[PDB]
Symmetry: D3
Subunit: 250 residues, 6 copies
């Protein structure tokens, strides 16, 4: 390997300069298998990497793991291997009543409720997406008729207390996070997820391009158990969007 | 007057929902002059307001004064009078070597070196521009052939120490700000100015749209003294851009 | 001009070393017209400057604009033109039940709810008035029989959320400021205004003298609509106080 | 699955109440192999879980992934499945000159350079290990003749800037972290790693027991490249220690 | 004197390397009088120092005064006189329902609600006890059959608001401390006291050993007025524990 | 005793409402000796209290101990016993070149480098002295011909690192404090001491009056070792001043 964690060499990327970065290994394969000549490059730790080809150009798909720390490793090491543009795709829960299940969210910037972002810039620096990445994601969403919302995402270092879940071992949320969700919702924040504050700050502060899209599988203000088919469909639409954005950015 | 500071009634705006918001009263007249049927509404404190018409729709031009506090009053009061979209235009000094005098900067989000932003959202919330305003401004800039840079601005509550100016009465900059400019340069920040962290945070957290464009009049990394014609022609150019963007947002 | 914003040259001040600094341009003229040989020097942006003469000595009167950012510009540039003492005068709303409309408040130090003060000293540094300025203001108040309170002022970068006003576009105050007014009132804070934390910190940390007086036109704990005559009278008394303090400091 | 991420049911754990929690899935199998009746339970995302038996009692081995966010999910979900005791084992780089390759570190508490710890306790709360776990780990280490150091670890949300690595894409470390390593060295901090501030804070504040041991594979103050056998033998040693400590805690 | 405050010379310690450090002067004599050859060395300010002999080795007993500032003086100056291990003993109020009056608490680490600790390490650094000191204290407690709890202590710079006492002059607790006790209790914190955050941080960060034991004289969740005999007895048991720990550490 | 720490009953104070509060018990007797009918009340911990009579009115003299925590107890308990006015007197080291040995400093407000102030007001609140106490102290100083400086003091929770002393056990000062002295010097801060940020913040936020004077015994910018007579004569002078100020406040 040329890098400490990912198990990749430079020539494995075959000159690729853009990576799609979902959180989980299983989603990596789903994305790669929508492109041409997909091949699995490595699986080490939370980092599963495939390569594929979009209109004859190599693209990398690499899982970050959950959370800013592992995201920050994957981004640094892909950047040492020549990636310059990073597009995150996820599935997510909306926290606004007007957002419906199956809609698509493109994130302009994130609330920094993480710690890794601070290791690249002080908290005053905005966790903001690159404008060409956000443009390409919005255009790609439009290209398939998706209902798209464009706006702020809250990016949390935890899945449970940081997102005000109370059905937990302790049933407790620390005072600084208790009632925080209501604050984000009053400020128009669309959803929570767990990697973007890190991803967007570290790229924006390091002259790398990054952007994020997600499909909505649950709305916590009108909460239903998701249907398996609907989740598969929404995941696939967000996967097409991020791939089509990739095509516009190359 | 329907509001505490600006000296305006609801009727004065004639149903306008968009305002262009420069910092100084003198630029208000320059902008309103590009549009049809320009009329002066009011001048109180740093707040000078004109109305004009663009493609048959009324549009407001109102000066903010320097800094987040006066900006916060102008935006709140114009929101109570029905403004939903706010476009800031300025002239500015670049802090990157690759940006030239006469180029145009469109701000995707700002470093919050201000205090009024904190009165609307905690510091972890991004001072992020509206995507439709940012798109309208970049497209407008490209439409008249501007050389355009799109990215992060540092937004300071001072002109002098917070922008690391040392030719001052004391010649001193407080420890937290000394060497901060080199940090923002390393992080790819384009420029400093003094109203956008407040304007962008307050609009983003209250469901108002905002965006900002500026024309470059000096580069601090290769600093030349500008002549009056350079400054006038750069101001004209940014003013043309912001009016063209207002046209696409109406 | 010798300075970037104010439009003043050194010799325009005719050797003046003290400036009275109200927030608004209209009040500048009212103060200057109580002294001898008043002349308007400049009006640019929020900065309206007059000169006058008190017992044969030149005094400057210069509006700061609203907020610490513009205050910080006016102070720095007047200091480069030789001013060493700065007295702010305002009209204000009291937040304590025992303070009556028409009473006079002299501020010993301010709660720093601003951002510009941080560009001169870290938050632990007190936004404290010069003792000879505060002495002269208290003595001047006594010299006209005013009812005087001497104590702390809360200095906010916003007029609306920072002062817990809820009759606003959004009707919302961010969590960190919601219930803050009750905290200041329990701590004996007399009133809010919007320039003193900046003014007092930047002078105290730069070896310039500063102090502040204000007349009370409303009490928010027993809130009445002010009468026009009472406001004019209270404004004039505070204007006499600051001028008489000026006379004692020269 | 009874839980959102790990892919486990309550029955799968067979009444286990103790888990050894390494960072990577590959080490899970190495640890489970030392114990009796090792069986694989589940592998989802960075979470690989085996069960085995120690002195006739079932014990869990589950990988956390890198960083506090994924660690926080694994601990919460294993707590909902009845785990009350969590023992982290790793390999690590020392930052003190007196620590040698092959020595073992047991962590009494950690410097919180992470973000997920903040989602359980404010920063003033100590990221402190359980005394019984720490005792079991030191006694286990001394039991096989390890050279043992017991003390403070720095726990970072990044591998690169937060541990002051400069051979990176940017070669830059943000101001707050530049020179931080020399501060932790002066303060007697033993090492860096990336999960313990979260693991220890969340357990200490929720009535769960946790502790951590690690084997030293590199010393950054006298840095040698390790061979594969050094790394395997150091890992074996720490793995033997953590299983021996689990035996004393059952 | 060889030091600024304590009034001690180096040779007065007769080679002692360990100090027992209670808060009050009266307790100093009680401890020294349980050892051999006790002699009073000095009483200056809050700093009363005795020497005595444990199994033929000199030990110092030195009051810190109340609070981190005076603790930090006594620790620095005893360290300049050769002390390397510092054991604090106190009497305390428990804040957990399961802790009984007459039980003994050994502190693993402290919540840092003080200011002096910040003058040795940033807030992220844990106020953690030395593991050999905490071991010796737990073993010493066991050696006399005491009921022992081992865990976190909240260390406050105030006795009244910081510990949420409301029967005070003002009856007020500042917002940041109002409802804090309930947070510590939900996080398992055992008790409050006023010197350990300073003591533990400054020693842990300076390569000195420190630990703390206390006997419980009141439980604030089931609050009774303490009986004089019970307080004397519990004090004596904690004094024996700290002396017996001293013996194990020499 | 009516209070937890000081060993005083309400009757002991004989209706006194003013206290002079030096740091050390030994200075209590020196101050009480200047007044009429001096009597010792109590000595517990660092708290030594005498009563005496000034112009026929009873006055209290009570030592605070070193640092905000013990100061906070003394002020709270003396407030419960009816003290409304507190005058601190000390001897101190100047940090400005223009201040001489034997000069007197009166403190208008303090830099909050302490922790107990935070238990009464958030850090943005000024640690400001009462105007009547400050006036009485300056007038008293001028009344006996002192050379008087009036201005800002830095108030530290430590004697050693927080005042940048390096001839210590470690010889190290933590990053946040290293170079802080030069910042306070640049900002015109007169001196360091260790009780006023707490004394002034707690009194200012609870409607109690406080002020502080000190005599200069060393100048750190031109540091001479003082002889015993210099120290005694400087102490006498400040003690005379504080008693004279108490006379004007009764
Ligand atoms: K992870
Ligand atoms: K302004
Ligand atoms: K003390």
């Amino acid at each position: 390997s040329d890098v400490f964690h990912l198990g990749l060499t430079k020539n494995d990327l075959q000159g690729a300069t853009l990576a799609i970065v979902p959180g989980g290994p299983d989603r990596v394969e789903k994305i790669a298998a929508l492109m041409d000549k997909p091949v699995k490059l490595a699986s080490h730790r939370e980092f599963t990497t495939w390569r594929a080809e979009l209109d004859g150009k190599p693209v990398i798909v690499c899982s970050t793991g959950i959370g800013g720390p592992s995201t920050s490793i994957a981004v640094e090491e892909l950047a040492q291997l020549g990636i310059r543009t990073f597009l995150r795709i996820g599935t997510t829960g909306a926290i606004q009543p007007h957002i419906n299940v199956g809609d698509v969210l493109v994130t302009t910037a994130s609330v920094r409720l993480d710690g890794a972002s601070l290791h690249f810039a002080p908290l005053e620096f905005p966790a903001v997406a690159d404008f060409e990445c956000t443009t390409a994601l919005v255009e790609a969403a439009k290209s398939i008729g998706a209902t798209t919302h464009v706006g702020v995402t809250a990016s949390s270092d935890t899945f449970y207390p940081g997102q005000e879940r109370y059905d937990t071992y302790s049933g407790r949320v620390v005072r600084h996070f208790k009632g925080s969700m209501e604050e984000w919702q009053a400020m128009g924040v669309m959803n929570y997820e767990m990697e973007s504050a890190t991803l967007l700050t570290m790229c924006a502060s390091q002259g790398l391009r990054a952007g994020m899209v997600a499909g909505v599988i649950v709305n916590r203000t009108q909460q239903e158990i998701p249907n398996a088919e609907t989740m598969k469909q929404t995941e696939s639409h967000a996967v097409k969007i991020v791939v089509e954005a990739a095509r516009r950015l190359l």
